[PDB]
Amino acid sequence: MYGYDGKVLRINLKERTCKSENLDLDKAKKFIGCRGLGVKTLFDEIDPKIDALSPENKFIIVTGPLTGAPVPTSGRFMVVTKAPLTGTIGISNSGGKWGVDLKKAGWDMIIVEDKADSPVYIEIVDDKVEIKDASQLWGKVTSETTKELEKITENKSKVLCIGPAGERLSLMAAVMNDVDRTAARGGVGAVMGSKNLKAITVKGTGKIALADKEKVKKVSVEKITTLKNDPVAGQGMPTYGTAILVNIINENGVHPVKNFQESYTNQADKISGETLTANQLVRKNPCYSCPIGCGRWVRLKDGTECGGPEYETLWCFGSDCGSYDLDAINEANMLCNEYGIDTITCGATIAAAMELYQRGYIKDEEIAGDNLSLKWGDTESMIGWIKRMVYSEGFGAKMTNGSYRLCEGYGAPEYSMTVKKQEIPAYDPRGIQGHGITYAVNNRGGCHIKGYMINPEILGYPEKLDRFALDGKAAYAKLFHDLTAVIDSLGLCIFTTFGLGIQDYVDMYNAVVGESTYDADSLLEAGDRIWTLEKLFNLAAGIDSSQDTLPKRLLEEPIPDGPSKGEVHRLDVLLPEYYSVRGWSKEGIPTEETLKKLGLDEYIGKF
Ligand code: SF4
Ligand SMILES: [Cl-]
């Protein structure tokens, strides 16, 4: 077909079968692709109440119709499965090259079922698929796993894999691809580990079918020109990476410090993208077909070269732990990529532990055997905790599954900066009202990128809003939630929003898939359908709307100092308005009229 390949790879690890199925084009179009196609597939094939580490969970790797097409940022794909860290839907995105090889191999999506009786890996070369013994790879870090597979797979194969953390079912385990790219949050890597799946190698020799090659080329050249002319997409991101945000968020007084105890630090420029570019940066590391190139390639203190850190990583191993050692952040990022864990949950769990120590919940005797401290700014101890958390060594075992469970153990849940048990990232919502809505209602838990209200409230895209204001924020958050669901579903990068809007996405989709398949209104409505489908999945999984909240600190403790001094998030007023503008009930339940309007009639009367 055009855009979509038309084929799905179903792999049952108990029966050790690899079978081809025809893609349901109607469903793939109705849910756009990638995210939406994966969630609908999972919802249709599992009971959401199941334990996410049970063999009955499904591990889905899905691409979008634009994944692999000659358009800007077409290297994106997603992992969809029940998320074991949160109990919610798991929707984790990754770039690099792996997903493009899968699409060039003729597959739009892989559904992995059940569990292998021993560690295995999947080897794909176009339509050739084999399950093989992975006993000699089990236990190896991402880089070594990749090098070992390169010795026994076809040249040019890309590697997707879990590290030791995923093998041990850590709830902060990530899915790694291309050595340093990752579908990281939700503990999705532990689902792969629960299936005894160590890796999937993929080589694709095909091309993505285009309905109109020359039109696609004309549309692509136009969008790239806009991105290259945009100050952020054309200059800031390529030069400083996402790390460009350090000084921006800090100057607005919404950069979390010491586990959100503060919101501003006069040391932030030591870990800025400007400092990184002037020192350890070797070069950009752009994903497939990407003119932005925000990817970082850096030099570790020992001279080793490797993928560099993103903004959220610079924050969680820097300001959040009271550390301002940039070399150390580069090392921590490498260690998280090698062990296969989400940087954000890792650093913010260490930050929660440092606060529990600050407040006397953790005693010196409990960590003496580890020979590490939990003192703010102790960079060496912070780095040392990573390995101990991954392998459950000494006190590290209490941090292996995240801050929410760690703080519950000490009877101090108030020190876990999480929503649905997932750690909130590097933006203090007390000074960003619309963005705080995203954190509270995000279907995948505490997360900023499924609703980056940072764009309009701080960066001025597509317009500048007053971040302290309340009027209009609920509706704006809904729009960003639905637009992000479209971009995730297409197989493109969210950073295209630095220059592009809905019509640009319609232009690229129609040029690739077929003239007039979607219009700006129908496509955004599809994003609303996808977000609402995720909500129904969470309701079926037992995730009540009462889990739409923020830590008490962010609702009651005014920011103590800085440009946002005095502010708290006003969720009490914004959440009901968010449900209302979504067409949901006061208990956050999609109404019968809303389900009919979104084409979700099969779910009427069930919630
Ligand atoms: S903007 Fe960055 S994350 Fe997005 S596709 Fe390009 S290099 Fe990758
Ligand atoms: Cl679960």
Numbering used by the authors: 1 to 607
Please give sentences taken from the publication describing this entry.
Here, we experimentally validated that ethanol production is initiated through a tungsten-dependent aldehyde:ferredoxin oxidoreductase (AFOR), which reduces acetate to acetaldehyde. All these oxidoreductases contain two metallocofactors: a [4Fe–4S] cluster and a W-containing bis-pyranopterindithiolene cofactor (simplified here as tungstopterin). To solve this metabolic riddle, we characterized the native AFOR of C. autoethanogenum (CaAFOR) by X-ray crystallography, biochemistry and enzymology. By performing the reversible conversion of different aldehydes into acids, AFORs are environmentally and biotechnologically relevant enzymes, putatively valuable for synthetic biology.
The crystal structure of holo AFOR, refined to 1.59-Å resolution, and its biochemical characterization provide new insights into the cofactor chemistry and the specificities of this enzyme, fundamental to sustainable biofuel production. X-ray fluorescence measurement on protein crystals confirmed the presence of W in CaAFOR and the structure was experimentally solved by single-wavelength anomalous diffraction at the W L3 edge. The crystal asymmetric unit contains two CaAFORs, which have too weak of an interaction to be stable in solution, confirming the monomeric state, unlike structurally characterized homologs. However, the overall monomeric structure is highly similar to the structures of the homologs, the AFOR from P. furiosus being the closest. The tungstopterin cofactor of CaAFOR exhibits a canonical composition with two pyranopterindithiolene groups, stabilized in a ‘bent conformation’ by the coordination of the flanking phosphates with a Mg atom. The W atom is coordinated by the dithiolene groups from each pterin and by two atoms modeled as oxygen according to the electron density. The W–O distances in the CaAFOR structure are, however, substantially longer (around 2.2 Å) than the W=O double bond modeled in the structure from A. aromaticum (1.74–1.75 Å) or detected by EXAFS spectroscopy (1.74 Å). On the basis of the observed distance, the ligands were modeled as hydroxo rather than oxo groups. One of the hydroxyl groups establishes short hydrogen bonds with the perfectly conserved glutamate (E312) and histidine (H448), a position that should be occupied by the acetaldehyde and acetate molecules and reaction intermediates. To evaluate the CaAFOR redox states observed in the crystal structure, we incubated the as-isolated protein with an excess of BV2+ and barely detected a reduction of the artificial electron acceptor (with an estimated 0.1 mol of electrons per mol of CaAFOR). This suggests that CaAFOR was crystallized mostly in a fully oxidized W(VI) state.
